[PDB]
Design an enzyme around this catalytic site. Structure first.
Site, PDB file in Angstrom:
ATOM      1  N   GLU A  37      -4.151  -4.584  21.216  1.00 35.84           N
ATOM      2  CA  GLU A  37      -3.030  -4.834  20.313  1.00 35.84           C
ATOM      3  C   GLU A  37      -2.953  -3.702  19.285  1.00 35.84           C
ATOM      4  O   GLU A  37      -2.737  -2.542  19.666  1.00 35.84           O
ATOM      5  CB  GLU A  37      -3.085  -6.265  19.720  1.00 35.84           C
ATOM      6  CG  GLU A  37      -2.799  -7.301  20.811  1.00 35.84           C
ATOM      7  CD  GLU A  37      -2.580  -8.721  20.305  1.00 35.84           C
ATOM      8  OE1 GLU A  37      -2.056  -8.890  19.182  1.00 35.84           O
ATOM      9  OE2 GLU A  37      -2.913  -9.671  21.059  1.00 35.84           O
ATOM     10  N   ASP A  78       0.430  -1.074  17.700  1.00 39.18           N
ATOM     11  CA  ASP A  78       0.775  -0.164  16.587  1.00 39.18           C
ATOM     12  C   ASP A  78      -0.484   0.350  15.891  1.00 39.18           C
ATOM     13  O   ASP A  78      -1.456  -0.395  15.719  1.00 39.18           O
ATOM     14  CB  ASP A  78       1.656  -0.922  15.591  1.00 39.18           C
ATOM     15  CG  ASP A  78       2.770  -1.651  16.306  1.00 39.18           C
ATOM     16  OD1 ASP A  78       3.442  -0.974  17.123  1.00 39.18           O
ATOM     17  OD2 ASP A  78       2.910  -2.886  16.142  1.00 39.18           O
ATOM     18  N   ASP A 106      -0.788  -2.493  12.000  1.00 37.62           N
ATOM     19  CA  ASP A 106       0.333  -3.463  11.952  1.00 37.62           C
ATOM     20  C   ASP A 106       0.118  -4.275  10.682  1.00 37.62           C
ATOM     21  O   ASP A 106      -0.603  -5.283  10.707  1.00 37.62           O
ATOM     22  CB  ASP A 106       0.310  -4.394  13.181  1.00 37.62           C
ATOM     23  CG  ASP A 106       1.329  -5.518  13.078  1.00 37.62           C
ATOM     24  OD1 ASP A 106       2.184  -5.456  12.155  1.00 37.62           O
ATOM     25  OD2 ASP A 106       1.294  -6.443  13.934  1.00 37.62           O
TER      26      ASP A 106
END
Lengths: 541, 541, 541
Positions: free
Chosen positions: A243, A276, A279
């Site tokens: 993630e 990202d 985040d």
């Protein structure tokens, strides 16, 4: 009763003297030595009886599922624990032999294999392969998680994992120093505080490196650092997580806001995460009323007063956005992103203070995304962009103000914003490889494409000490350059003077004591003269 | 004689086996476990007999006043101690429910209340309320201080405090790692070395967070890092201290110089201190001869050769100066200050090297203070200011030189200095929201208000691809713009040429082969021509 | 069999119970206490039997030569060891009483004296004195080195040395935290992995300070951090080492490549090293085929794909280069160098990304060296130079591109490169102390010395609110400025218009509806007029 030996020697019990970790914990007084590997069962619990223990780990906790640690006393320390999976998981490995992204979904699917060393477990965020996975893989049981429940003021030093991780539930003042030899399972370290309306605080990771896992290297749920800013992440390398490099959770879990406030993120290096680089968002998706948090009426979507401090971040070749955040009253300073596949830097909030941003080669996948985006009214100072494509804008920040912006190379150099600050300094000494170079000025920047003024230096002979040039200066009319003065055309050392094509009206000379040339109806050259007293006469030549 | 058990087990004694800490210290050989809270008496002393101890703290030292630790052996370590007040002090709390400053002295006075969690004890530096305080408050007895006397090479890990702190007297090579859960009493950590002519060295804090206290989070007295630069503070958050974020003491204590040299301050975050974000000064107030330090004749006031390194500092909403220092030969790099109530950055010394400074919204209280001040001859490179007021100067540095300066927004953009460096680069492409924009040049900057040259791009039609503009260029005379050329006034594509109002003298054409227009005594338009050979003729039209 | 005491007390053995360290290691189970100083013999070995030990050091290892630690179990920790020389070495001390370099070879030779506190042992890299040294000095036997052989996953905390150091041979995942009280002998910490074709990994130093030694504070041999970037140095002060602040070894040792890949160097402060502030090079000297590394055909000399990350570096008064590297695909951000005696920053490789470099007073010894050099095709963004000499170039980077470059002061401001990026911003407001200031434009920068355009603001009266100026604009021809327009010469508010010296050809007016003045063969002033239809007429006045 305490014997003489009891008064002179350090109390320690060791796991190898017991069948279970609970038996060892029950016997413990001061120190607890993990001297042999321990095979735990999913859902196992250890009650530490409120004792202030030193848990010295010299072996691993091995299992599939969760090992719960309950009633660990405030002030305990856990030294070099290691969470190791029992079953070897199938992992997806999104990189080739040069360490570059593999994105062909067929090739990605074929990378799925049992590994203990690299890749992460396939999951729902893996939109490219999720629907194509055979049952044994989607349904695999693996991964070792330590869940520390309702503990305050615990220090973990040098924790490790092999397809494992650490979950702190309803904890405060947890300090995790220098995770290392750490191959994560889901998120590497999670501070999970949404089970009550209180906000977790003081929970921090400092130092080290977390690798892989399907989640984010560190994940915060319902944490608030206070005006104290006591909480967050410092000096971490986040490598190839599934993630985001680190993450603040968005929206609700189980019906309560899982958002976060007032944390510090300082010196995070994120390499090739799948989402990202960082985040640090609080709202996501479509607006829905917040539960046990500020209402929509108090703060609109994406505009919560999160007041994070984000500084000294560097991210490289992240598949998502290079670094981003929402909310307002955040301070962001010194963020460098390379090779972001989406935008390089993105402010989804408003009323943030943003300084010293360097974005290089964002929009790496050429999907018409901008290098730097701000959606609200933010203030940007000290911005460097080097786009390796002409797509989009260098800075797309329509409601923001910008100062000290530089756009390098031959990629997009477009800046869209409300206000661009002055350039200040001394003598101006500019140079260029091309034979001509320019000063261009584009006022009315919201509604013009072309500059209102262009001053050109055009080198006609480039011989050192024997240079020749033409100087030019022009206005614009109906979108075309006009009224061009020149100096030294063809080496004749003269001014070329633009003259009107037809009768000049008196209004076309602004100031007293000035003249303009024009051509009459039969091409007669004439001078309109505005005298020192403001009256006019015309000379025919 | 050592028995077989003596040869196989770790030596530790525990406080709960004794009545006093001294009895436990006397019995100790290797380790000393603090397993129960200890109530000390003000002035209590513990003699550790030169032993190299591991002092493992699993409980608190509780008292009002001082606990002295004497003869602790070099190489000892003190693990997670906690200094806790016995009496709950009255504290002043200078913040409202939004975490903003409260400055109304009546409201500040009303905030004084017994607290263990926040605020600091009122004292003399609290000029707004000091004279108004009722006796029980000024005369309160509270606060727990550990005083470690004449120890070398001691490491403290993760020290804590609740209205308490740590005082190191005549110590060297003290390393304090990661203070945390730390609510200070006076200064949080102090290295006090003025009792002899030697200079304390190697004393450092690294990591963590210190909150409140009436003093500075870390305070240095008569410390010198050597050319080694071994000493100072790294990676600290200083939150709401009553004085400065960190501080080097000034002038004398008890008759000896308490000043400091050659320290490193790296990565300090100061939030809402009542004085200065950092205070790295050595002289203060009116000049007085220095004792056991350089004389006034050797170095004038404010100009000691302190040679500190200050880098990576960020401060927010500090009531004093955002960050400041005096002395010379200091290196300052990467300092960011937001919302300083006084100046944003201040160099009270001379001959310092200052780079990468960002000041936003200093002079927050609108008392006519400048954003950045230097009093001496310093060198500044890479400066960004964003004033939210027009008061004063962005950079007030009369004897300094500056390079790469940017002033954002609509606040003050004034720069006063000795030398402003060149701007370098390639093509120039500037833009503005307003319909006209300018290049202005102001030579003789020490003695002019108005620019000597203004070049204007004035957009008259702002339609994309259909733009119209006027270009203008003008000199100045008697403080008014004059001699204005224009191009394309009213869309006629011509040059408007300024002409002399009366007889042009031969001296008014500098170069051979040039002309100037002028009006004669009866308004006759004429041309003075300076021929290629330097002689003159006049044409009447 | 384990007795009841065995089940309740921590196992520790102590050195004072044995004659040798081996006897203590043999007896050890869990902890090993070094409670008395230990005099080792050169070549002594200790076999730890694969045990996972806590080695708690409360005294020193003293010897001349090497102490070998073999079979230390993975997961062991070594706490505050101290390597101390037995014999006091002769050291060279290259500094005067002000802490400045001494370079007179006679004075340097006279500094050679027995010391335990400062200086380093003279050696071959000491080209100024090596040949002049008397036998007792070149042949001295001194220095204490711990050699840890073939260990994985060991943590050292707070190691110290007095003319000593630490050598890790064929180790991986060694973490050294906070070296301190550390006076090195050769290189302070070395990770030596060239004995096999594997690459050492995970070996890192974090925190602290290393002083003196004849080598580099930390030295890497055949280490590769992986795409993980797990390995390198963070938060270190390197003070007065005899070689480079930190170093990656170049070329081969014993016939195998000793080079290094994919490390992170973050926040290194190097003060007065004798060679380079950092030396992150992989190739050196004349090209020779690489052994067990990429071939010359795969990557040319100086162009290996090292992919290091180098950031937040500061160096001061280093005798070599301020900071340098070779190879390609490195990322370098935030490097500040002061007083480098050679170049300030040097890229000996190609295809690197370089940002936020500040170089002040490089080429301090005036040997005609440049401030910043790049030898290959690198990309530089955000460069500040302040040369204190006019020698050489500010940026000498012929094949590189540059953006956002500033050159301060009165030293060299020359920039040589392939491409210089645009300047962007809003209104331009420049100022200068001198009475005149300029905008100069130099296109064809590869082949011109002089600018093709100069626009001058010349202040003739510098009285606030009563200013007078002349504006000038000129082209160039045969290396001399020509075609100069002026405004307001001598305060007459007129344009001075340059006219051709002889017959103007039709080609010398580019655009329809324009005129140029010229002098005829008998000095007659005339106007060549290019009508709106492109045809021509000449007016005689």
């Amino acid at each position: 009763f305490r014997s003489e030996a009891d008064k002179k020697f350090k109390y320690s019990v060791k796991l190898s003297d017991y069948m279970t970790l609970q038996e060892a914990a029950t016997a413990a007084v001061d120190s607890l030595l993990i001297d042999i590997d321990y095979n735990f069962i999913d859902g196992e619990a250890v009650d530490f009886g409120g004792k202030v223990l030193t848990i010295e780990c010299k072996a691993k906790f091995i299992g599939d599922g969760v090992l719960n640690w309950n009633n660990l006393g405030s002030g305990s320390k856990v030294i070099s624990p290691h969470m190791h999976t029992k079953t070897t998981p199938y992992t997806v490995y999104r990189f080739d032999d040069n360490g570059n992204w593999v994105t062909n979904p067929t090739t990605v699917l074929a990378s799925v294999a049992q590994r203990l060393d690299k890749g992460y477990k396939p999951n729902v965020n893996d939109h490219d392969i999720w629907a194509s996975l055979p049952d044994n893989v989607k349904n695999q049981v693996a991964g070792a998680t330590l869940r520390v429940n309702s503990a305050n003021n615990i220090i973990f030093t040098h924790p490790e994992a092999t397809m494992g991780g650490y979950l702190f539930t309803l904890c405060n003042h947890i300090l995790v120093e220098s995770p290392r030899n750490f191959i994560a399972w889901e998120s590497g370290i999670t501070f999970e505080n949404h089970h009550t309306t209180a906000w977790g605080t003081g929970n921090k990771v400092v130092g080290g490196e977390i690798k892989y896992g399907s989640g984010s290297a560190v994940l915060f749920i319902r944490n608030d650092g206070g005006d104290d800013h006591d909480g967050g992440v410092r000096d971490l390398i986040s490598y190839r997580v599934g993630e985001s490099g680190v993450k603040t959770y968005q929206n609700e879990i189980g019906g309560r806001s899982a958002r976060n406030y007032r944390l510090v993120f300082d010196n995070i290096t994120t390499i090739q995460c799948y989402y990202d680089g960082i985040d640090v968002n609080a709202d996501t998706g479509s607006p829905t009323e917040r539960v046990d948090d500020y209402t929509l009426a108090e703060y609109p979507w994406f505009q919560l007063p999160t007041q994070h401090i984000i500084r000294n971040i560097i991210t490289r070749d992240c598949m998502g956005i290079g670094a981003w955040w929402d909310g307002q009253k955040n301070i962001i300073d010194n963020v460098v992103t390379y090779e972001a596949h989406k935008e390089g830097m993105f402010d989804r909030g408003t009323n943030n203070d943003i300084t010293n941003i360097t974005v290089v080669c964002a929009n790496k996948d050429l999907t018409n995304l901008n290098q730097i985006v701000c959606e609200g009214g933010s203030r940007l100072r000290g911005i460097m962009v080097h786009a390796y494509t002409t797509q989009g804008y260098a800075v797309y920040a329509p409601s923001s103000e910008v100062s000290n912006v530089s756009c390098a190379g031959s990629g997009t150099k477009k800046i869209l914003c409300t206000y661009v600050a002055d350039i200040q300094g001394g003598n101006i000494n500019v140079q260029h490889g091309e034979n001509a170079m320019t000063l261009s000025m584009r006022p009315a920047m919201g509604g013009t494409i072309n500059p209102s003024l262009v001053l050109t230096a055009d080198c006609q002979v480039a011989s050192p000490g024997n240079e020749a040039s033409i100087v030019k200066l022009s206005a614009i009319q109906d979108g075309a350059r006009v009224g061009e003065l020149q100096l030294n055309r063809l080496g004749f050392k003269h001014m070329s003077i633009p003259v009107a094509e037809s009768q000049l009206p008196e209004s076309a000379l602004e100031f007293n004591s000035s003249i303009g040339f024009f051509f009459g109806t039969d091409d007669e050259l004439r001078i309109l003269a505005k005298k020192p007293d403001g009256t006019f006469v015309t000379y025919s030549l």
